[PDB]
Design brief:
Chain A: This is Putative tail fiber. The structure is cut from a larger assembly and holds three copies of chain A and three copies of chain B. Chain A has about 80 residues and is mainly α. Chain A is built from one helix and no strands. The chains are: A mainly alpha (about 80), B alpha+beta (about 180).
């Protein structure tokens, strides 16, 4: 403890809180970031969803073709 | 105005809109944490003149509840909801030193440096208002005089504390550094 | 030495700048809304990271898998066809 | 590019303006994550199927090598 | 746009729950200055003198505080050189 | 620092002495085993 020493301690302040303007600016920054992400990544995800839907449709179709051809040739060679 | 109620903190300039913290009462030295640099305060008109007419020195003013700076400063600080993360203060980080308004007592266990350094001051300055609440004048005057004497002693101590390690003699400074 | 990132808790009982008993509510509401906006932004970032990473990774994985599988299957089918035609 | 200093209530009201847009963009991302979960379910089903096929082909090729 | 900064006059209370920055900063100020007019209503002179002196001291402290936050943190020498664009 | 046999200067930045030349100092030997402090160089 200090008796009269002024450097022996340092009383805190009311509160280390900013003004409403800084909080509003932080909220606006977070919102702009989230909105840019939403927009861009949502366009990307929609394009990717369309592409992959068409791709998996083509994939399952060609898979049916391959499997029917496979069993056809299999039974054809079995009969010989 | 004394050290124990001071407070240092980094600021966020944002080239202009930079706002004054709530606990602002009086500004001490203002500088950065990179190679050292001290700002000087000027009036709004000087900054408005600097804006058009035109970077070693850096000035600033007080526009209502803001701190304006002529150069487009880009000081950076962590946002509000940041959890801990001291952030290892980056460059261009100005550090402000001012006098912060101390907190008001709200619990019996709540203490303050004033109690441990000079309780008679508070006791007299509050017996003043006590003897005012009730009808009494002699006590009011005596307590006021004693509190004022204690405060004068404390401010005189603060004064004798600053620049108290050696004498001073300006070595005829005529800007030896001019080339730059 | 420190930053002013803590939340509002009291009013400036002494000081000509800052908040008042009739304005502290505004400070607290602004802080709450900013924290909620940051929570939303982080949740969106995590959702998008999950989506992108998982989709791209699994797509590439099973795409290369099915591609190499189809290549080996067609090659084996051609070999079997040539061996059959040979006999 | 400098504005005035509004009262705290105005800044508070301005802060809340950044919530509805997020609420809608999440009311969309929920359906998005549902869709990608359906896609992951289809993918794990196709992976189980491809694994069954791979094992059956291992066995059939072993049988082939054994016979000729 | 053009910005103007003026000292706006505050509105009258006209309500119990209403408040102001003064009630939080210097309630003793209004307390003493209204007890002054109270002790004027009733013929009480010594009380008037005491309350007026206390209010004056409080207002002096406030105005002095507003002065020690002004353009103080710098030397008063080296008069500025905002002359012209013609060097 | 900007515009700068070697005099020394120091200030008080709230609770920190700041010397310009960037001098270096060291503390003496701490041991309490009834031994001298053995002051340190520089």
């Amino acid at each position: 403890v200090n008796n009269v020493g002024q450097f022996g301690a340092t009383e805190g302040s009311i509160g280390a809180y900013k003004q409403a303007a800084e909080y509003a600016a932080d909220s606006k920054y977070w919102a702009l970031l989230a909105e840019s992400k939403f927009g861009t990544i949502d366009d990307l995800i929609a394009e990717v969803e369309r592409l992959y839907q068409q791709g998996v449709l083509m994939k399952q179709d060609i898979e049916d073709l391959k499997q029917d051809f496979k069993d056809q040739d299999a039974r054809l060679m079995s009969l010989i | 105005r004394i050290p124990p109620l001071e407070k240092e903190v980094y600021l966020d300039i944002k080239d202009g809109v930079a706002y004054i913290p709530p606990d602002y009462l009086e500004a001490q030295w203002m500088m950065r944490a990179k190679d050292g640099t001290i700002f000087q305060v000027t009036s709004p008109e000087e900054i408005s003149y600097r804006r058009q007419h035109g970077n070693q020195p850096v000035n600033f003013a007080r526009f209502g509840s803001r701190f304006i700076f002529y150069p487009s400063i880009e000081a950076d600080t962590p946002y509000y909801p940041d959890d801990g993360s001291p952030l290892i203060p980056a460059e261009n980080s100005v550090i402000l030193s001012y006098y912060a308004d101390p907190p008001e007592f709200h619990e019996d266990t709540d203490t303050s440096t004033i109690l441990t350094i000079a309780p008679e001051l508070l006791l007299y300055f509050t017996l003043r208002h006590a003897c005012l609440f009730v009808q009494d004048d002699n006590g009011v005057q005596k307590w006021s005089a004693l509190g004022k004497a204690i405060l004068d002693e404390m401010v005189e101590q603060n004064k004798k504390q600053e620049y108290s390690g050696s004498p001073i003699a300006i070595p005829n400074n005529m800007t030896r550094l001019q080339s730059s």
